[PDB]
Amino acid sequence: IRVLPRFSADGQIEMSLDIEDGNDKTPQSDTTTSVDALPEVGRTLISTIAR
Amino acid sequence: LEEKKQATVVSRPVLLTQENVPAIFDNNRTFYTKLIGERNVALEHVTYGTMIRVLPRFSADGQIEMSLDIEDGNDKTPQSDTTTSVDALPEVGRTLISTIAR
Amino acid sequence: LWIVDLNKSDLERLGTSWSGSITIGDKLGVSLNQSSISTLDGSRFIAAVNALEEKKQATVVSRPVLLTQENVPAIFDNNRTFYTKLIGERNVALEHVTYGTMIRVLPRFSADGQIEMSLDIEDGNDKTPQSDTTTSVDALPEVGRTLISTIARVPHGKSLLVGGYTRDANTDTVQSIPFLGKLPLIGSLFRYSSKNKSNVVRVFMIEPKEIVDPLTPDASESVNNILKQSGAWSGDDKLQKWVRVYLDRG
Amino acid sequence: LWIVDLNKSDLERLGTSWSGSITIGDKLGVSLNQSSISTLDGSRFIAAVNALEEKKQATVVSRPVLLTQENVPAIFDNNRTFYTKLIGERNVALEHVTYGTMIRVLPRFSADGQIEMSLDIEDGNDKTPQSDTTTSVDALPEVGRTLISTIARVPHGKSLLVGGYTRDANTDTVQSIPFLGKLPLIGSLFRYSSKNKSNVVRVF
Amino acid sequence: MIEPKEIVDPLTPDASESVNNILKQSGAWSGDDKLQKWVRVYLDRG
Amino acid sequence: LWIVDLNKSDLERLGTSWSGSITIGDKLGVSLNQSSISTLDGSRFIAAVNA
Amino acid sequence: GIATAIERLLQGEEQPLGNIVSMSLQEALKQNAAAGNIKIVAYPDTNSLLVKGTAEQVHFIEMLVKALDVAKRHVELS
Amino acid sequence: GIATAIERLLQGEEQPLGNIVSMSLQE
Amino acid sequence: TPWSGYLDDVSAKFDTGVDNLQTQVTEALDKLAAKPSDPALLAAYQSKLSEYNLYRNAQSNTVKVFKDIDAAIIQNFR
Amino acid sequence: TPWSGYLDDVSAKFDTGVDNLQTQVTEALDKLAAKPSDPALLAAYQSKLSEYNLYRNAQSNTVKVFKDIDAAIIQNFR
Amino acid sequence: TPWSGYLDDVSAKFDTGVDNLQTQVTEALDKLAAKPSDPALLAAYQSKLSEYNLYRNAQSNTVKVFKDIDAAIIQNFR
Amino acid sequence: TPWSGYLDDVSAKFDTGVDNLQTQVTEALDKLAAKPSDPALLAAYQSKLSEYNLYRNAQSNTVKVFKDIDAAIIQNFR
Amino acid sequence: TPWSGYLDDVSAKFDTGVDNLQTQVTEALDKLAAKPSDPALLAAYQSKLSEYNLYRNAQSNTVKVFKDIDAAIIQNFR
Amino acid sequence: TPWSGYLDDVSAKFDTGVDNLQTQVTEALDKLAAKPSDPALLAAYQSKLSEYNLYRNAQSNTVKVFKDIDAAIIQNFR
Amino acid sequence: TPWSGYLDDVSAKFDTGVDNLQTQVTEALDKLAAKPSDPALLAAYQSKLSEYNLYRNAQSNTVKVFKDIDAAIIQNFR
Amino acid sequence: TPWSGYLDDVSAKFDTGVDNLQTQVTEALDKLAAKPSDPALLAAYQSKLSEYNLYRNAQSNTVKVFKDIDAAIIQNFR
Amino acid sequence: TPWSGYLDDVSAKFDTGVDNLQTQVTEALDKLAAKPSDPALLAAYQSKLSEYNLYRNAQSNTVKVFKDIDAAIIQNFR
Amino acid sequence: TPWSGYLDDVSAKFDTGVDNLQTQVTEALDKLAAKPSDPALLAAYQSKLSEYNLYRNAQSNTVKVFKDIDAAIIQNFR
């Protein structure tokens, strides 16, 4: 996560977000219950300003 | 088969400096653990890197403002093949902070 | 400057783990815990029991000293190579670790009597994958590489810390058989416990002092106390006599 | 300049460590300390006992002398190769280490009689993985590589320290079996003790 | 977590007092040997 | 110019060191000083004396 | 920073300066100071500014910098 | 350092100086 | 941390891939030299030596190719 | 976001042109190193490594040609 | 999903050209270990092992030649 | 309207002189990145890559010549 | 119309210079992989692989020489 | 305050034109120096180094061209 | 301070990137020279020698690139 | 006192900007000439030799720049 | 004084790394030719000849690599 | 007394840097030509030839570099 926030007059906070999350795509963990043992999540990327 | 695992590690670096001057510190020890066997013999080990770079300043009211960047963790090592070896030495993720705070 | 290390640890390992296979009538094959039937068909079940505990505690204290003048730089570094006796004289091998230490300073004076110095130091051993046997890593301790870069002023004749490092760590685990590891009769026949606890402290302190006068007694007086007590003084021989007195007293 | 080293050490090693395996009726296999039954079926449990203690002490004292005129440089360096007698004349081998030492100076006078010099000195051997036999590393002592870079003035005819290095270190460990290492009869039959102490001083 | 603090005074007691409580209790003090005694006191106390 | 060197030395080596192994009934194996039982079962313990 | 912001702010502009909103012949020649004659340098090891000028503009830009560094506030993300 | 800060502060600027805040014709 | 390159790690995957293969050859050799007429010991040593022969051959041919891949890319830098 | 030029994008097309070839060589080596005498494992790793060997050679030579193409045009600027 | 190169498509042609030769070798090992004294089982096992030996040797030299054919073209890029 | 001089049009004749070379290099690379071991695809790609290397080099040197023709005369105007 | 340069025309001449070498290599491999123990198919496939191997080396080296002819002349334009 | 001419602004356009290429070259060298034998790291580093080579060459040659344009006009002042 | 340039700093990261590689080649040779017929010692030294060759090859060509980058820039000064 | 103009001071800035490169080149040549086959000594010497080349090239071209600047002004005296 | 280089120093280490390998080969050959039917002398000589055969093979290939390390850097001088 | 320029003094340091290497190459050849089948003489002469190969290559390329440093500076005189 890399951010750059700011304030407002009314009390809102505006931040400039870019976030990434996930594992690298590794085809491994060959036996059946091993991939069930540790779940996987897809890679992501956001890039958004928000108050 | 069933098991429960719980691990704890607590570490502090200390250092001093003067106002408005930089100061660097880093450290990495290599920690071993006793693999069972003296003739059928092997070992496995992990490092623990820690780095801190700072630049402080004073205020008028007495507050202290510091400018932090820190790194910590082990290197990504495929090793410790046996089951309890990874239990023997815990792991921590690589990290990076970059933040000023008073 | 003072390098002082304290190390303390303990470790236990207790319990067993079972596996294998039996067959019945060439009609059923039961395999506990990854015992492949493709390598064994009549080989009955085996076990593997562990029982071991040890305690480790280590101390190292070292100081380099040196002097310099005001406002000029001064460098120092050193690295000895330390060995230890691996058990065996014909089946023979050796192992060794180095120990580097470096201090670089650039001092100045003050008005109130404080001394301000500009320090950068590195210390530790090199990363050697060696020392394969158990007590060999116990034989020679390891210390992490380090780096400081800090200015500090300190009044004359007293002492100041320059930086340090502490660490404490635990590990607790219990491995067991689900159904059979809880009955009060022989439930301790199926457990596997291995605790671990460690703690370590490492700190550098410093203290300077001003020096003006020469050293009493002389160095040549000192070394003559050395050789006559170590049993090596060689001024007695009337063949080496000539050259030594020709150089010694002028 | 005076190079003086004092070395003193000792080391002890005592105790045993046990391993092996028993089998029961080809129905059960009990294995102490990672003895895989896939390599052994009838080899019973063994032990391995160590008992050895030694003390080591070493001394070396060296002085280079030279003269010079005021304000001119002067260089000196030296490297001898030191051998030691490995046991054997037909079953014969050797091992050897060099010893480099270098001093570069530039003096001047003062008004009161002091002499100010600008020193840089090096001394020691190179880090050589060699000297394979046991007493061979005892045969030739080692000294660390060093470097000074310092200006110093000193009154006439007297002596001054230029920098040095001391080190003290301990090591204690006991390795044993948990339950049987506690019985009051022969519980010391299952220990493995190794104390260690070394201390070393080196000054120019 | 982080916390700073100001430091003004030098350290009481001395470090050499601290380590002599350390070394005489850890069992490694080498002022007893009458051959290394000379050089160690020649460097230590001036 | 005069180059002059004088050399003088002496050296001694005396004593022994013991190692080896005995076995008992193929039921116990006692090994003095790193003598692996996997290469020897009946070679009794030896010495090596230097003078 | 500051020692770049108000340096290039007064770029060029041979002019005097007036009043911040958020004897005559002597006082007019000191009121004939160039805005571009201000020279400001930073000095980090005491967290300070070195400014220079005539008898009112050293007083004047004191009023600017007292309303330019406010104490910032902390914000914590989750 | 010092010998650069107030060096580059007074580059050029043929002028006299007044008073620090934190014979007549000859004089 | 003891450094290991990628070619060190490729040769290390064979080293971590076998548990005690360096041990298994030495133990099988001591029983053969003690009694070099046992058919159970000859057939066990024939299998492990030929396995150890392909063991060293598969590691060494792989390291030579990645050396030449690495030497081919760096020449194409400039 | 890490910026990527055209020479990065040509080399990226080789990276995206293969689906999981960097993994499959790693998958074929770890399965081979467990038992390095299986002809089914021998034939899979020779095929996938040699495919990966030609992969890196084709990657490194293509970027090398466009470097000399770009450098000849920029030299003809002045 | 397993990615497939040209040598994968070449090695798959060896795989589809035989129906169950990888399967038929496994049955001859299973018949020999149950009763290792039948001459009818011995004569069946000599044919299938030598066929599987020529299978792996002919595949491995073909992938090795096409690697050097492709590498001769890829070297001729720059 | 994008203006085009004579120097734009000489370099444009190389672009219009070839039909679909920006397309043909990219499609052959995409077929190559899908399967980077086919000699029929490599030799087709070898032909197209070597032509594109000579394409830009022949394009860029001619514009450089016409630049140097105008610059020697224009200095000799005044 | 598929565009063809001069280097394309020399390399296209290799494709038309052999009649069905792309067919004959593929047909001899498909008959060999069905039954990989026939010496008539081994001797037929050894011949067809060796002609296609010498085919691509002669194809790839010919475009490179005329490229080296072209690169020496274009530098001598300006 | 760094003063910026038009020549400063053109060179700044190369500096602002790449996002984090100065970071990507430095980070890839740090990843390379930890293990300078990984083909995934080598092929990534060849691309970024060749990108950095054309970066400075295109930047420095353009200002060199624009330097010579202004001096010919300024000479025609007097 | 003995001065070290930027070209020194690129080559120094390779020197600092390995911890004791100069020692590890020498230590593996000393065990090898006592008995140069041990397959465990040849295969350990083969990995480290091939790693050390690529170390120097990556070091010497990279410094060569930055020398050639700077000389094109230094040429565009005057 | 050796007199030094401003053009001397620009060339002196290269002389004072580096501490001891004239010593380090001479010292690196003498250690290389003692044993001209050590890769540790060659890579250290490649860096220092290339460092002395860029030192003089940047030195000689900058003084050359200020001469033509001065020569353009002095002609406009009369 | 006979001069000795770094390659001389590497080659002297193989010669000094073995104690009397040049002696042990010569002594084992004279005993075999006196009585070429002793099983204790044939098995002793096969072991010692194979160690010296691998001795010369390991020395000559290692000197060849370090020659090529030096030749790649010296080529990168100019 | 042989007059010596700067290029003479760099080349003279290699000649004086080796004591009698010119003798050692010729003497090892003369002992080898009497009996060109001694492995002690073959391995010594292969070693000595590689020392002589790196000797002349390092001398001749280094003198070429210092010529090119000097020739770039003298052109900037006028």
Coordinates of C-alpha atoms in Angstrom, one line a residue, chain B residues 14-16 24-27 29, chain C residues 1-6 60-64 100-103 119-124 143-149 159-166 201-207, chain E residues 11 15 19:
Chain B
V14 CA 18.3 0.9 20.8
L15 CA 20.5 3.8 19.7
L16 CA 21.1 7.4 20.4
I24 CA 22.1 4.3 10.4
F25 CA 21.8 0.9 12.0
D26 CA 21.5 -2.6 10.6
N27 CA 22.0 -6.1 11.9
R29 CA 22.4 -12.6 13.0
Chain C
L1 CA 35.0 0.9 23.1
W2 CA 33.5 -2.2 24.7
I3 CA 32.0 -5.1 22.8
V4 CA 30.1 -7.4 25.2
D5 CA 27.8 -10.3 24.2
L6 CA 25.5 -12.4 26.2
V60 CA 32.2 -12.8 24.9
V61 CA 33.8 -9.5 26.0
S62 CA 36.3 -7.6 23.8
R63 CA 37.8 -4.1 23.7
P64 CA 40.0 -2.4 21.2
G100 CA 36.5 -8.9 12.0
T101 CA 36.2 -5.7 14.0
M102 CA 36.7 -2.1 12.7
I103 CA 36.7 1.4 14.3
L119 CA 31.9 6.9 14.9
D120 CA 31.4 4.2 12.2
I121 CA 32.0 0.6 13.2
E122 CA 31.4 -2.9 11.8
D123 CA 31.7 -6.2 13.6
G124 CA 31.1 -9.9 13.3
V143 CA 27.5 -12.7 15.9
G144 CA 25.6 -10.6 13.3
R145 CA 27.2 -8.1 11.0
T146 CA 26.5 -4.5 12.2
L147 CA 27.0 -0.9 11.1
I148 CA 26.7 2.3 13.0
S149 CA 27.1 5.9 11.9
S159 CA 31.1 6.7 29.8
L160 CA 28.3 6.7 27.3
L161 CA 26.3 4.0 25.5
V162 CA 26.4 4.0 21.7
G163 CA 23.9 1.3 20.8
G164 CA 22.7 -2.2 21.4
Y165 CA 20.3 -5.0 20.8
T166 CA 18.3 -7.5 22.8
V201 CA 21.7 -9.3 24.5
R202 CA 24.4 -7.4 22.7
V203 CA 25.5 -3.8 23.4
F204 CA 28.5 -1.5 22.7
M205 CA 29.5 1.0 25.3
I206 CA 32.3 3.6 25.0
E207 CA 34.5 5.9 27.1
Chain E
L11 CA 26.2 6.6 32.6
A15 CA 31.1 0.4 32.1
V19 CA 31.9 -5.6 33.0

